Amino acid sequence: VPHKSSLPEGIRPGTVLRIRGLVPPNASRFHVNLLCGEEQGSDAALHFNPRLDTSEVVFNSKEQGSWGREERGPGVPFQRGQPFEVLIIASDDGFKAVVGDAQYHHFRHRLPLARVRLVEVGGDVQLDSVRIF
Amino acid sequence: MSNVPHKSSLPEGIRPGTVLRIRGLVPPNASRFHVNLLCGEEQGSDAALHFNPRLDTSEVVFNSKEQGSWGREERGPGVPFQRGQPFEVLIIASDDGFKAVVGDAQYHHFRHRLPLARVRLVEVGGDVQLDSVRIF
């Protein structure tokens, strides 16, 4: 079952999302989604998708039911059997993804930051905590 | 010789979305310590933010300094620092001010008095053992 953090006021430049958890021993992939509503199939301002089985981290957006063009970060800073800490930092121009205290990828906004209403974490991850500062 | 404040430069300044992470330890007999967001490298430069945990009065004072004059102090609730204990502080810049997070809890919101665009260095001084300043 996915974890959901409701943000009915939305988020602004200066919003910090900290996601901690464990990648379990046989994990295929997991995701952190910044969604614009609570309906299934809602728009995704950010889809952050570490894929352990393919050794890729995919970034994408979803807009009226259709996915955009994927972006990929450099390699995969996640491992089966290892805990992680991800920061997703909203600024005026995009999201900064920090993994293991290292700046990892910058994802330019494709949807207005103001439309975000929900953070959802799902897939093969054993969640420690999601915090929004 | 000891107690020289630690400085970290901000070569391109800071913006909404800048995250300052300050990790340290409060010495067993600390009086007070501070984190300053300063607008220049000279003594007496303006402080966009002065974050001043005071253990001997059990309070946390927030303020700004402009033209060598301190502004109106604000205080957070109580004091989430303890002598002899490690701490982690987040200072997060937004459009409307700085959010101070202490011990993983939102602690105070200090609305901007000086422009974020003028902040050019982080200074940590007082009775504190500084482990790391990281800028995200």
Numbering used by the authors:
A (entry chain A): 4 to 136
B (entry chain B): 1 to 136
The authors write:
Galectins (Gals) are a family of animal lectins that bind β-galactose-containing glycoconjugates, and their carbohydrate recognition domain (CRD) has a conservative amino acid sequence. To date, 16 mammalian galectins have been discovered, and galectin-7 (Gal-7; also termed p53-induced gene 1 product), belonging to prototype galectins, is a multifunctional effector by productive pairing with distinct glycoconjugates and protein counter-receptors in the cytoplasm and nucleus, as well as on the cell surface. Gal-7 participates in diverse processes, such as controlling apoptosis, cell migration and cell adhesion. Gal-7 was crystallized in complex with glycerol under two different conditions.
